[PDB]
Structure 1
Amino acid sequence: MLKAGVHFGHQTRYWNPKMKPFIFGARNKVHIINLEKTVPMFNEALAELNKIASRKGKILFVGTKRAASEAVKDAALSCDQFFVNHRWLGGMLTNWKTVRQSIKRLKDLETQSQDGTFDKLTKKEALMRTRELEKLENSLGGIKDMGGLPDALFVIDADHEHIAIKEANNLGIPVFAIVDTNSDPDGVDFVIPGNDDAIRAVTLYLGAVAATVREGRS
């Protein structure tokens, strides 16, 4: 908008040449992103997400970078959506049928957990069951109670999470990644240029999306 609440690219030697249209003049040894062509398509993407949420699209959030972790887990579970926070497993979409069993095991174990040591006092087994529950909840916490095959994905870092992008392209699901100067627009994507590691930037990104999605239901 006008606060310029987003930083810009990394360096002029780590850059994908496909981003020439989106680039501005680089001055301080680093690339500068043209903000004059970031507002309109951002608003278009927001409208698209609004109409999808009005269609109960079950949006999905990703972006594991140790920075967006808590941010995306707060933006999710806020309106009506799900999220992925750690260690995107290869095949959550192309091999969802196998991940269903892991979800079922997690459901069983969380039901058993609330009365865990009552069933048996052999402390070794209780300890290892709790340890494996902890090991299992981090990779499936945000997706446990979702139907399956979401209708939209929002990605924070494009090149860093290319596995999810490839899976989405294979399945045929629209995606809404954010592309920096060292990434490239490859899939069918509503492209949002701008920095992706600045906390203010990512917060500004997710606030509008969360508000739009929560409005879309009503």
Structure 2
Amino acid sequence: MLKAGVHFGHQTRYWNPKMKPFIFGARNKVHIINLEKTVPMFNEALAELNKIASRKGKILFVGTKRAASEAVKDAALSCDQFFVNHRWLGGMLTNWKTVRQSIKRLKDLETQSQDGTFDKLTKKEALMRTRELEKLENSLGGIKDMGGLPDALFVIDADHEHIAIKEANNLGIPVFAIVDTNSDPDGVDFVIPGNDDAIRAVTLYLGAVAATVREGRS
């Protein structure tokens, strides 16, 4: 209900014209996001998020820009859910029959860090295996515990995470994305018009969303 007032955004002087209903202009060559038309749909997204969290749908959080790179970890690993904080691999959803192999290798390497590849072999091979494990971990991170495809996708930038959105639309996964004035509503299933390149705002979005999910676990 327009509480924080730190999510006005505008991303730029210019815009994407499909964002017209949610904005008005400002003196700084700036597109003020209509929060009065953001809070109603935000609750709607929270309402459906509460509904799918009751069904235990393995909600996935996606954020790669440095603002939300670490916060997505804080919100996903907070309660019960998964995340993608580094680069979204092209096709980690549509081509999940292949990405599941990399998770299997990551688990095997994670096991090998406890019984195998730590001292049973040379440093010239133990180092590169360990280097590969952390390379695999940062990319295939929170989704390592996901058993398959998710049921709902949460996105911080529609424009930045366009590939992930297109993959979810290709599948049957609702996309709960927050959109700036430069983003594209065409493709997401629950728009949340607001600022996205700011810590003060994304933490508010994630904190509200995670709290809704934790209620949904009941």
Please classify the TM superposition score into its range, dividing by the shorter chain length. Answer: over 0.9
TM-superposed CA distance for 1:69, in Å, is 1.2
Please tell me whether the aligned partners of residues 118 and 126 of structure 2 are also in contact (alpha carbons under 8 angstroms).
Answer: no
Q: Residues 73 and 85 of structure 1 are in contact (CA less than 8 Å); yes or no, is this contact kept in structure 2? A: yes
- How far the C-alpha of 1:26 sits from its partner, in A, is 2.3
Give 1:145 shift.
1.3
- Return closer, same or farther for 1:11/1:152 CA change in 2, 3 Å cut-off: closer
- CA positional deviation for 1:12: 6.2
Question: Over residues 60-116 of structure 1, what are the superposed CA-to-partner deviations in whole Å (9 max), with x where a residue is unaligned?
Answer: 000100111111101011111000011100111111111111111111111110234
Counterparts of 1:14 and 1:70, CA distance in 2: 28
TM-score scaled by length of structure 2? 0.94
Separation in 2 of the partners of 1:64 and 1:188? 18
Assess, with a 3 A threshold, how the Cα gap between structure 1 residues 116 and 59 changes in structure 2: closer, same or farther.
same
Q: Which runs of 4+ in 1 moved over 3 A?
A: 9-13, 115-119
Q: Relative to structure 2, which stretch is displaced further, 126-135 or 112-121?
A: 112-121
Q: CA deviation at 1:199?
A: 1.0
The verdict on how the C-alpha distance between 1:134 and 1:47 changes in structure 2, with shifts beyond 3 A counting, is same
Count of matched residue positions in the alignment of Structure 1 and Structure 2: 218
Query: Deviation at 1:118?
Result: 5.9
Q: Distance in 1 between matches of 2:114 and 2:159?
A: 40
CA 1:104/1:46 → structure 2, altered by over 3 Å: closer, same or farther? same
Q: Give the Å deviation of 1:35.
A: 1.5
CA distance in 2, matches of 1:103, 1:139: 10
SS at match of 1:127: helix
Cα deviation 1:21-75 (Å, max 9, x = unaligned):
1112422221111111111111111011001000001000001001111111010
Structure 1 residue 6, shift from structure 2 partner: 2.7
Deviation at 1:121, TM superposition (A): 4.1
Distance change in 2, residues 1:217/1:11 (3 Å): closer
Deviation at 1:13, TM superposition (A): 4.1
Superposition deviation, residue 196 in structure 1: 0.3
Bigger fraction of residues in strand: 2
Residue 10 of structure 2: SS of its match in structure 1? coil
Give the percent of matched residue pairs that are identical in Structure 1 and Structure 2: 100
**SS of 1:31 mapped into structure 2:** strand
Residues 178, 192 of structure 1: 8 Å contact kept: yes
Indicate conservation of the 8 Å contact 1:5/1:200, yes or no: no
Q: Quote how far apart the aligned CAs of 1:5 are.
A: 2.6
Equivalent position of 2:193 in the other structure? 193
Q: Is the 8 A contact 1:62 1:156 kept in 2?
A: yes
What root-mean-square deviation, in Å, do the aligned CA atoms of Structure 1 and Structure 2 show? Answer: 1.6
Change in Cα spacing, 1:117 to 1:217, as seen in structure 2 (3 Å) is closer
From the superposition, tell whether residues 144 and 11 of structure 1 become closer, same or farther in structure 2 (CA, over 3 Å): closer
Of stretches 132-141 and 10-19 in structure 1, the one that deviates more from structure 2 is 10-19
Match of 1:156 in 2: 156
**TM-aligned CA deviation for residue 122 of structure 1:** 1.7
Aligned equivalents of 2:164 and 2:117: distance in 1?
A: 39
CA drift at 1:117: 5.6
Q: Which moved more, 1:48-57 or 1:137-146?
A: 137-146
TM-score (norm 1): 0.94
Question: Relative to 1, partners in 2 of residues 1:151 and 1:82: Cα closer, same or farther, differing over 3 Å?
Answer: same
Question: Are the counterparts in 1 of residues 2 and 39 from structure 2 also a CA contact under 8 Å?
Answer: no
Q: Deviations over 1:146-193 (max 9, x none)?
A: 111100000001111100010000012101001100112111411000
Distance 1:124 1:14, change over 3 A: same
- Give the conservation status (yes or no) of the 8 Å contact 1:116–1:126: no
Q: Secondary structure at the match of 1:67?
A: helix
- Select between 35-44 and 25-34 the one with higher mean Cα deviation: 25-34
